[PDB]
Amino acid sequence: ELIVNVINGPNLGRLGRRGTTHDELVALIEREAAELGLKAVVRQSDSEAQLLDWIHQAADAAEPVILNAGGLTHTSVALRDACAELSAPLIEVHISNVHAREEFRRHSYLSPIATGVIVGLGIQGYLLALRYLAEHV
Amino acid sequence: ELIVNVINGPNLGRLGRRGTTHDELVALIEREAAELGLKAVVRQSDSEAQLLDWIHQAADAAEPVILNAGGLTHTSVALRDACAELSAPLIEVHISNVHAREEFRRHSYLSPIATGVIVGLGIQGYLLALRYLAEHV
Amino acid sequence: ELIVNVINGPNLGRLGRRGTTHDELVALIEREAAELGLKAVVRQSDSEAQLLDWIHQAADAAEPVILNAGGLTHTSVALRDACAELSAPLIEVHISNVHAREEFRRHSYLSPIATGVIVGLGIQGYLLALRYLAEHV
Amino acid sequence: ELIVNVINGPNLGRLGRRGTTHDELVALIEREAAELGLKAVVRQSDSEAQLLDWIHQAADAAEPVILNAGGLTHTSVALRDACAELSAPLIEVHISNVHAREEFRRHSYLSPIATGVIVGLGIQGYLLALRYLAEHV
Amino acid sequence: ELIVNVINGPNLGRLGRRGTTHDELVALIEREAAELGLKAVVRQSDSEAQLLDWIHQAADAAEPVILNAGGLTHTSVALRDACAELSAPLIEVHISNVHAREEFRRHSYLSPIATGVIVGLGIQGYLLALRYLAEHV
Amino acid sequence: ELIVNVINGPNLGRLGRRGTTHDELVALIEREAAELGLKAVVRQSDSEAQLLDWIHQAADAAEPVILNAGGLTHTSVALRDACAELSAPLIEVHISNVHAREEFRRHSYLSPIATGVIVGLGIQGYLLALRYLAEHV
Amino acid sequence: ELIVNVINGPNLGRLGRRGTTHDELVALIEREAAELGLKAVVRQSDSEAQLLDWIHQAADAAEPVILNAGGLTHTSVALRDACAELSAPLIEVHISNVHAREEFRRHSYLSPIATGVIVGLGIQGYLLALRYLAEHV
Amino acid sequence: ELIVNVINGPNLGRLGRRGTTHDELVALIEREAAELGLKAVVRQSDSEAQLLDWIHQAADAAEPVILNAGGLTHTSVALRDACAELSAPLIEVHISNVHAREEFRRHSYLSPIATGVIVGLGIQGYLLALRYLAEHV
Amino acid sequence: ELIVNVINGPNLGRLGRRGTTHDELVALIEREAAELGLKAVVRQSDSEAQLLDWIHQAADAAEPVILNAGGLTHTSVALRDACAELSAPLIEVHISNVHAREEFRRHSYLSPIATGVIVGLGIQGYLLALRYLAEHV
Amino acid sequence: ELIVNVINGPNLGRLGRRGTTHDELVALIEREAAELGLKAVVRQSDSEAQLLDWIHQAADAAEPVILNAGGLTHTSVALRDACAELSAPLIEVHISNVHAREEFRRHSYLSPIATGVIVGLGIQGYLLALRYLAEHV
Amino acid sequence: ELIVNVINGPNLGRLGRRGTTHDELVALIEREAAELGLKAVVRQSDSEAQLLDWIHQAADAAEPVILNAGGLTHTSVALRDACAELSAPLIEVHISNVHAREEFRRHSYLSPIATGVIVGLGIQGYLLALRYLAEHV
Amino acid sequence: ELIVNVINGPNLGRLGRRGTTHDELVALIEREAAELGLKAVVRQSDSEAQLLDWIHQAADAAEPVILNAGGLTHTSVALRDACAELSAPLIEVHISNVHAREEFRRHSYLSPIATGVIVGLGIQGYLLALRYLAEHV
Ligand SMILES: O=C(O)[C@]1(O)C/C(=N\O)[C@@H](O)[C@H](O)C1
Ligand SMILES: O=C(O)[C@]1(O)C/C(=N\O)[C@@H](O)[C@H](O)C1
Ligand SMILES: O=C(O)[C@]1(O)C/C(=N\O)[C@@H](O)[C@H](O)C1
Ligand SMILES: O=C(O)[C@]1(O)C/C(=N\O)[C@@H](O)[C@H](O)C1
Ligand SMILES: O=C(O)[C@]1(O)C/C(=N\O)[C@@H](O)[C@H](O)C1
Ligand SMILES: O=C(O)[C@]1(O)C/C(=N\O)[C@@H](O)[C@H](O)C1
Ligand SMILES: O=C(O)[C@]1(O)C/C(=N\O)[C@@H](O)[C@H](O)C1
Ligand SMILES: O=C(O)[C@]1(O)C/C(=N\O)[C@@H](O)[C@H](O)C1
Ligand SMILES: O=C(O)[C@]1(O)C/C(=N\O)[C@@H](O)[C@H](O)C1
Ligand SMILES: O=C(O)[C@]1(O)C/C(=N\O)[C@@H](O)[C@H](O)C1
Ligand SMILES: O=C(O)[C@]1(O)C/C(=N\O)[C@@H](O)[C@H](O)C1
Ligand SMILES: O=C(O)[C@]1(O)C/C(=N\O)[C@@H](O)[C@H](O)C1
Q1: Residue K14 region, left (φ>0) first, then alpha (ψ -120 to 50), else beta?
Q2: Side by side, which strands form the sheet with C39-44?
Q3: By the 8 A CB rule, do I109 and G102 touch?
Q4: CA–CA gap between residue A135 and residue G39 (Å, rounded)
């Protein structure tokens, strides 16, 4: 199927003063998706409720999700539970290597329900997640 | 007093694809409340802030609350603290038996401040909570 | 610099039925700030996303922050991460002595990134935080 | 006919700090109406213009009105004139015995155009007004 | 000057079920004004505050006012006081002969500050008020 | 307590064409309040319903009120009744000496429930009311 | 009575690229109405629901209607039924001679309930409909 | 299941000047539904698009529908097609006996896809449709 | 010219529960358009008035239209008439073979004014319509 | 053609404290237009963008324009360029004799593209511009 | 009089990346005003129309204005003309020494109508303008 | 970097009646950008303030700008000053050869601060500006 949802959570709108901005990340993702024959829909919110609604829509549409949940990765049971309804693949992405950072960042509520997880590969992590989904149609 | 607040948290709007829908649950609750001589006000949100506001209103009105907080049961100190202001009974309800599921679901921030807790009895749990409140006027 | 942000999180709007109201707290802070030659901007929200936006603005303006995050003190990685972007001082304040209360309240995601922390001194804690910032220009 | 309008004027939203709240009053009225085979539509406003619009709608629908106009009972010719257009019964209700209070409260612009008046019987006054209308179909 | 304000108060929107409707009254006034070389601006509200704002605008513009205040004729000091600021003529109009009706309708807060008063001549009263203003330029 | 509410009713927005404007009056009040160690919150409306809501808020906050109700002084039972709920002092102020004017202005629905009344001292009346409240803490 | 409603349906906003524009048509109608001692209220919509609401208002006001329903002439039972409630005359107008065009345009749901019908006389058809209504008062 | 949707189309808001009003019809339906152990959700629109959305929601919820489509009964393929998605029963209702009226009213796009059809039994037709659905659970 | 409008009418938003969703259809169209050197603007509405406005815009821009009008294909003269203003090609598309279905679906108000018509080729019908327009520049 | 646009730019809303107000000017223009068999549409804005939009509409409608651009007369190339699209006459009007004032006011970006220019004849300048257009049909 | 308007034009919201921010400038001005016994109202816009409205309000209130018009200093006749209506002092301020910069910045439309002008003294220029107005009451 | 801003000023929305429309220009730019590996964000406004905000965003994002400012090219110091904050390249584009037209069009406030300028090459000028930026990364 063509459509892949890329959903970014809290503080990811701040990319590029936290070099690559979130707008630039959207552009990079869109270009790579077109190359792969996909259509990427990229969304970012600091609101858990908004993220939940986007995940609910992806469940109702049976669309795959690439999710970088920011701080809610480590803290939100609610976001996990929304993701548990997804029928298509869920790929967890983090820009930083969360396993090399504070202890609290080494625990994810999403990893057990995700198909797979990419961390520490920068923004290329998103592009690699897209290529997985393209080669897994 | 006639009025009981029934407040549902994250992902409870998704009932009936997660058979009984949330609209149907509202109908069942309303019917049982009328039978018991009560009026039930049933509300659902995926927003912690919205849930907090509803709990604040119930505190200011000295109205009892039946609360199924969804994932925030396990995670939100803020929701607990809002519930601590309530003067009337607080009944915690979960549809599933949270004690039979993942370890993280066996811990609730609400149970220590609730009057009581019903889990694992399905949607009938709400109806049983209503009957407690009716027989405790 | 003149401006200091005072940001209150969940349930702090309920001060004075939880004697001093939040409006009164704003007045007290404003008066003390004028005495110190500062301008205080006091804001309160029960919404994590709203708190994040206010912290983002303070980062972009290089303004100091006095933050009483309420229940999110103990639970929100996202709020921590927003505060990590601040270049000016961050002073954590709690009205109650959180170290004398439930175990879960003795852990803060903010303390490790804050300049300093004041707890248990009541509403005067805010005024003392302001005086620190004034004497540290 | 099934429908009865119950219209409350200024300060009646403050019931229960001025024990029974306005929400509770609505619940009590609704329950009694169902028992009587009626449907009660209960509305409250501190705005004369809003009350006038509700009375205008009841005139256009030929629906009966139970009206507790609050302070406007004693002061508003405009509200009287709107009520003069009603074709169905108008029942004036006051919770307090207005004849036992200040002199200005013993004069009503509505009493001369009302079918009848109940005062001093508490919130039961509304329920008794409903029973009149039910037995007068 | 060309412009005359015609301002109708409470219950005057109900003309023609209380034969001529308020829309028809506007049409009649507009036609007569054009014949007289004037421009009539006709407005109606059940809101005292709205009437006050229209009178305030006419004061700031030094425009004459034809005012049929409905029930507020007999009751509103506030409307009187707004009219006291007018520099151009104020003509009070009532469709019915208020002196032939209930005692309370025979007292007007506006008559002492009006240039003159027309009552009991029907809707033609407005047209006669316009002709006064035209012949008094 | 720091906060005092100053509430102006109908036509008081027109000050300074009815020299000192309402904006200027707000400035004068704010300055005097700061001198006295108070915070003044000054509001004006031509809407009775809006005034009622502001008085309701002051009742719920146990804050004192300085009220110049304009024409509603003489006419509104509803405004009186809202003021009767206040627990802190109510000071009635009029700029003009109402006892030297028309007979209808010599009767107030508010005076019997007010702590005290200042009339005829101009805009300084407000400043004197503030000084009373400051010396009565 | 002065008021006549002129109601245009789908595609009539496109006049003057489909020479005379709809704005110009409104102007022509208004001028002719003034000459005849009438007031014309001219409205156009591509929305059936909006047309229905305008017809409902004309029924409640007992005002005559000149209706050029565009394509809905041939297709809408709902519009017919709304027009059946009118007590004053209904004049059907079409700019083009619908009887000289496609077969489907030679059938109207409105003609059987209209007083009369004018087709093929251009925009003058509206002006002639107005003159009928003026001479039939 | 408890919930039944009752959907009324064009001109059904005009009931009771076209004796029983639409508000009264809602009341009658609600009462009968409660007696039968159901919950009725009654909606009316003159907009085809709005009716389509309500039918779409009933399809997604697998809820039964009682539909009186007004004039669109005879004309709308789109409404038919929306109803074809319903999995629960569809009961077509008309207040009037459409088979005794104009020829065009004797053809329905909905009858072939409806479970059954009630016509000519007045407003009781709705109540009888509800009783069918209750006895067919 | 680059731009082609693809306009879908009633019930086409329901694709993929009526496998391919409307979002997916948009993606497929966009990709094929880019391959052909075109830009496709894809819009869907259940509102006739909205469809009319989109067709009006395409007329004013002299842009070609691919139109799948859903049920309005068979019923709307208004939509036909809007399409008659188009100067660029109009291609009618239906996913299903309408000639193999109910008799009423074998009649189209659009076919006589369309350049051409594709039916029964699924969603590929849209892509084939795009390729026609690209090879006809 | 009947319609003439009269467009006023910055500071022209302030007429009558800068005797005749802008409202009065509108009235005078409307009356003169009716006498001449025209319809005048009079608009005023302090926003260049708003003026541009009004000129764009007049270009699309092939309607004549009487333009008093205020200060933008001397400064705005953008307004000139919008006026260059007009096909019907453009008449430039100024109330004051701009040639007798500061040097900067003696240069207009509009005069070279206008049909003609009237200055220094007061508000009658507009009426004379209207009479030109009427006699030039 | 207490009130002074401080109005900033285009690009002045960008202060502190173009050290002192606009928020900080507001704070500095407010503090200095309080010291001088004044109340400063500080506003900034990139919209000429918005600046014009603020100047219009200051004219109607007979309040003094400190104006740093940004680029419109050199270009806007409209802003000049609005300022010409002011009866109280107008003080022109620029942060930079405009006489040391490009030739076009050495010409101001405002200087000839201003009381006086301060340039090149930084943000202190505003504070010095305030002190002028305070010593000139 | 991928993103380039293309910003069009006054009257550029009117392209294609002033053959290629603004929508078509957007399409052409988008296609060329994709070919070059860029993402173009194309915006048009007749509002100087809106253009300023878009330039401010591009400054904060360190994104390059292709700017065709329309008439403001020749007149706006404010727009120049906003562009002076840009750190990435600024390319000035005009469709027409401004040096062959009126004298006032041969002067630009933007040229001295732009990297470079393209005029007179039609809409291809934008595409050539994009190719510069792509080859200058
Ligand atoms: O490295 C990442 O992508 C992160 O998701 C960014 C975060 N917030 O935006 C973190 O909280 C996190 O642990 C890692
Ligand atoms: O079983 C329940 O009712 C739950 O509250 C549902 C949840 N979210 O909606 C859970 O997160 C939960 O643990 C149990
Ligand atoms: O004592 C405080 O100031 C607290 O921040 C208040 C809280 N919510 O408003 C707490 O959750 C907390 O632990 C302490
Ligand atoms: O007793 C009552 O019900 C009253 O209507 C309440 C009032 N306001 O809410 C009064 O002003 C009144 O006289 C009595
Ligand atoms: O006769 C009139 O015109 C009146 O103003 C109508 C009223 N309300 O609309 C009255 O209250 C009145 O006394 C007379
Ligand atoms: O003198 C005053 O302050 C007054 O309150 C002003 C009024 N309206 O604004 C009056 O109606 C009044 O009697 C006195
Ligand atoms: O000729 C007319 O006036 C028409 O009503 C115009 C139409 N739409 O605007 C038609 O559909 C029609 O048949 C005739
Ligand atoms: O009799 C009915 O219920 C009808 O549905 C009412 C209609 N519109 O509201 C008709 O168009 C119809 O044929 C019958
Ligand atoms: O097959 C199609 O594409 C159709 O247009 C779909 C419809 N509604 O969405 C029909 O009403 C139709 O006849 C065919
Ligand atoms: O005299 C006029 O009509 C003017 O257009 C008024 C102005 N602004 O409203 C001027 O700027 C002008 O030069 C003349
Ligand atoms: O130096 C100043 O304060 C200026 O007003 C700032 C400007 N825009 O914000 C200029 O255009 C200017 O010439 C000087
Ligand atoms: O030729 C161009 O692109 C121009 O920028 C268009 C204009 N407005 O849209 C002009 O004012 C201009 O001089 C040239």
Answers
A1: alpha
A2: C39-44, C3-8, C65-68, C90-94, C116-119
A3: no
A4: 70
Could you tell me which residues come within 8 angstroms of residue F97 by beta carbon, excluding any fewer than 6 positions away?
F119, F120
For G115, the token pair is: 């007083």
Q: What is the CA radius of gyration of chain C?
A: 14
Instruction: Measure the CA dihedral B132/B133/B134/B136, to 10°.
Output: 90
Q: How far apart are CA A114 and CA K42, in angstroms?
A: 53
Q: Which two three-digit tokens encode residue J64?
A: 């004549």
Crossing angle for the helix pair C48-61 and C77-84, to the nearest 10 degrees: 10
What phi and psi values does residue G31 have, to the nearest 5 degrees? -65, -45
d(CA A35, nearest CA chain C) in Å: 34
Domain boundaries, chain B: 1-137
Dihedral angle computed from the Cα positions of residues J14, J19, J24 and J30, in that order, rounded to the nearest 10 degrees = -110
Token pair belonging to G24: 């110009």
| Pair J108, J67: CB distance under 8 Å | no
Buried b (16+ CB within 10 A) or exposed e, C24-58: bbbbbbbbbbeebebbbbbebbbbbbbbbbbbbeb
For residue A115, the Cα-to-chain-centroid distance in whole angstroms is: 12
Three-state DSSP class for F28?
Answer: helix
Q: How many of the other CB atoms lie within 10 Å of CB of E19?
A: 8
Distances (CA, A) of J17 to A90, F13, J20, J79, J102: 68, 20, 9, 27, 21
Measured by CA distance, the residue closest to atom 12 of ligand 8 is H70
Cβ(E74)–Cβ(E108) below 8 Å: yes
Which two structure tokens, joined as six digits, stand for K43?
Answer: 């506003």
Q: Which CATH number fits domain D1-137: 3.40.640.10, 3.40.50.920, 3.40.50.9100, 3.40.50.2300?
A: 3.40.50.9100
Atom of ligand 6 nearest to the CA of F93: 3
Mutate to test the interface with C, among B51, B77, B104, B110 (most CBs of C within 10 A): B77
- List the structure tokens of E30: 């507009």
Tokens of G13: 């906003």
User: Distance between alpha carbon I13 and the CA centroid of its chain, in Å?
Assistant: 13
**Residues sharing a CB contact under 8 Å with residue E124, sequence separation 6 or more, in sequence order:** none
Burial environment of residue F103 by CB neighbours within 10 A (0 to 12, 13 to 18, 19 or more): exposed
Cα–Cα distance measured from residue G96 to residue G98, given in angstroms and rounded to the nearest whole number? 6
J136 in active site = no
The torsion of the CA quartet H70, H75, H79, H80, rounded to 10 degrees, works out to 110
Report the phi/psi class of residue K38: left, alpha or beta, with left for phi > 0 and alpha for psi in -120 to 50: beta
Experimental method of this PDB entry: X-ray
Expressed in Å, this structure's resolution amounts to: 1.7
Q: How far apart are CA I92 and CA B86, in angstroms?
A: 63
Atom of ligand 4 nearest to the CA of D9: 9
Residues of chain J whose C-beta is under 8 A from some C-beta in G?
1-3, 34, 37, 39, 61
Q: Which residues of chain B come before a gap where C and the next N are over 2.5 Å apart?
A: 18
Angle at A38 between CA A33 and CA A40, to 5 degrees: 65
**Nearest CB to H78; choose among I10, I17, I50:** I10
